């Protein structure tokens, strides 16, 4: 074994009774984080999404275009977009689009969601975030989905007896990981929220969340599209008018 491959904080195997280093093992990863990367991609596809043409184009810009063709951005002289925040009413397809991205991308897809980074022990959510982003950097290019970020990350409260200072610390660590020293190399983040007005201005700041995609409820044309999408596998009788059903459904989500 060559020393140069033996970097700090790496696992190595030692012979018995001699403690001789004889192999470099996979880098240690917290089991909660390790079982957090996606191994089997969802089966959702961009063809299962209807009425989200512009949202798909913008999200695809932010994620696909930089990783695939950083030369374009270098020629433009601009910095690559880094983060995208999906928001909108309930059920408009915010997680459907994330599943479609995970299925259609060839980048390492990591997924946090809900309060997976909220731990009763002190200073554990921050550590889990650090380990997450270390894992993403290792398996770059990476796309980190974060569903329901308002759970882990929302308007900060004054430090007192009635404030979640620890969840605030977790969010601060996440902010530092998104944009602090040593900017991320190829990690792109897709946060998803159902109410955006409460997220911390630090999270919503550009550079951390470069783009913000709204998901309005379908406008009867997206509703016709969704009806077709979800009735394709169905024995529809003749004379059945999905346009009439779409009209009958005003302000209804996907």
């Amino acid at each position: 074994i060559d020393i140069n491959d033996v970097t700090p904080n790496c696992r190595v195997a030692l012979r018995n009774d001699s403690y001789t280093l004889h192999k470099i093992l996979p880098n240690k990863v917290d089991p909660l984080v390790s079982l957090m990367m996606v191994e089997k991609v969802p089966d959702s596809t961009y063809e299962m999404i209807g009425g989200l043409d512009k949202q798909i184009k913008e999200i695809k810009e932010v994620i696909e275009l930089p990783v695939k063709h950083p030369e374009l951005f270098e020629a433009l002289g601009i910095a690559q977009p880094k983060g995208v925040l999906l928001y909108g009413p309930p059920g408009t397809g915010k997680t459907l689009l994330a599943r479609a991205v995970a299925h259609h991308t060839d980048c390492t897809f990591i997924r946090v969601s809900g309060s997976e980074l909220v731990q009763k022990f002190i200073g554990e959510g921050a550590r889990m975030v650090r380990e997450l982003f270390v894992m993403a950097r290792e398996h770059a290019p990476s796309i980190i989905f974060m569903d329901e970020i308002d759970s882990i990350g929302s308007s900060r409260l004054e430090g007192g007896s009635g404030g979640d200072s620890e969840v605030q610390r977790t969010m601060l660590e996440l902010l530092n990981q998104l944009d602090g020293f040593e900017a991320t190399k190829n990690i792109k983040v897709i946060m998803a929220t159902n109410r955006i007005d409460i997220l911390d201005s630090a999270l919503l700041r550009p550079g951390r969340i470069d783009r913000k995609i709204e998901f309005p409820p379908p406008n009867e044309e997206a509703r016709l599209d969704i009806l077709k999408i979800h009735s394709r596998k169905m024995n529809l009788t003749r004379g059945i008018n999905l346009r009439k059903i779409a009209e009958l459904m005003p302000g209804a989500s996907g």
Partner: protein, 405 residues
């Protein structure tokens, strides 16, 4: 109405708006990065200093020192001599973290100098004693003590006359002139809590005490008393007070004791009862079912309202002293102290500056003097003037009162 870039779009945008040097620049930058990686790889790794002495100080044949005197004696504490049964002693040992054992001596040329709890040395295979050892010293508590006196005297503490007098009484007069106290039949207070707004001369007075006193002074690191291994903090405070008692006249200086223990209400703090337990042991040591000896305690804290009433009780903290914001005379004195060393004009009105800085602390005034010097520097001037000091006051104290004319 927004086309998506096709194969031709990307194959032309990378090839149409293009400098004839772009490819070479990119390749050269990549080569530089790779070369940097390779250079770091080859010369990487220094020689971590392992502690080897310069040659010619070593002594080979120490392989014989490793084969003879080989016994890597473990240390054990003889907790019971089994009554010695007259003959056939059959000592008992308490090898910590390992086990208890019933053992005997071996070549112990002084089978009488064994005692109980004498920290004997014991072999590995057969646990016979070989050599006793002096009592444990707990290096953490050993270095907690202050050895080099800080260079702060009772002349850089301006604006604190009554507080300095009280602290001097309680901490020094019982040590250097017991005759007056014994004559008047008064036992002087044993324990002082210095409290005030953040930055008023609390730790500065502690430093002045450390400089003046000729007696043991123990600065207690508030973080060193909190550990894992429940009971460790209580053990450390116990050993600390034991060493203080060993010393003829001791002065402990718990700083920022708000760290070690506030109110004892647990409720959801079931995981923070260890700190409360070490605080309770500190309380017991300060005053309990035992004389405390010539141990005097100092306790500094900004917030003496989170503290436990059992700890604030005036049997443990007997001479609570408040470091209030200095009055005008104190502020003028602080300006004089801090500007003594500065290169300033000879007609600056420090009384005027003290007036301009109300409700300001000594640290605030130090900052004002530093910023005055900084303003002088930011103008290539060697002498800081009254104007610079006024600018510093404006910048530090504050950062319109037309209704208060």
């Amino acid at each position: 109405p927004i086309r998506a870039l096709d194969e031709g779009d990307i194959a032309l945008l990378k090839t149409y708006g293009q400098s004839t040097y772009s490819r070479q620049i990119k390749q050269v930058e990549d080569d530089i990065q790779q070369l940097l990686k390779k250079i770091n790889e080859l010369t990487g790794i220094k020689e971590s200093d392992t502690g080897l002495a310069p040659p010619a100080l070593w002594d080979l044949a120490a392989d014989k020192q490793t084969l003879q005197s080989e016994q890597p004696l473990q240390v054990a504490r003889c907790t019971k001599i089994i009554n010695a049964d007259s003959e056939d002693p059959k000592y008992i040992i308490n090898v910590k973290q390992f086990a208890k054992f019933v053992v005997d001596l071996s070549d112990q040329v002084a089978p009488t100098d064994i005692e109980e709890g004498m920290r004997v040395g014991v072999d590995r295979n057969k646990y016979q004693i070989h050599i006793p050892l002096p009592p444990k010293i707990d290096p953490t508590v050993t270095m907690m003590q202050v050895e080099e006196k800080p260079d702060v005297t009772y002349s850089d503490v301006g604006g604190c006359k009554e507080q300095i007098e009280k602290l001097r009484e309680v901490v020094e007069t019982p040590l250097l002139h017991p005759e007056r106290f014994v004559n008047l039949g008064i036992e002087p207070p044993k324990g002082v809590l210095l409290f005030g707004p953040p930055g008023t001369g609390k730790t500065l007075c502690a430093r002045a005490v450390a400089n003046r006193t000729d007696a043991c002074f123990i600065r207690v690191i508030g973080s060193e008393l909190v550990q894992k291994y429940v009971g460790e903090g209580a053990r450390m405070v116990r050993e600390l007070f034991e060493m203080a008692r060993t010393k003829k006249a001791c002065l402990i200086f718990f700083d920022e004791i708000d760290a070690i223990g506030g109110a004892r209400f647990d409720d959801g703090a079931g995981g923070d009862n260890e700190v409360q337990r070490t605080m309770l042991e500190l309380i017991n040591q300060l005053d309990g079912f035992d004389p405390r000896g010539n141990i005097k305690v100092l306790m500094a804290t900004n917030r003496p309202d989170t503290l436990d009433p059992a700890l604030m009780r005036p049997g443990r903290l007997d001479r609570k002293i408040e470091f209030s914001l200095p009055d005008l005379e104190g502020r003028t004195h602080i300006f004089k102290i801090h500007a003594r060393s500065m290169s300033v004009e000879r007609d600056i009105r420090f009384e005027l500056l003290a007036r301009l800085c109300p409700n300001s602390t000594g640290a605030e005034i130090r900052s004002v003097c530093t910023e005055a010097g900084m303003f002088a520097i930011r103008a290539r001037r060697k002498i800081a003037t009254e104007k610079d000091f006024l600018e510093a006051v404006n910048k530090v104290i504050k950062s319109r009162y037309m209704t208060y004319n």
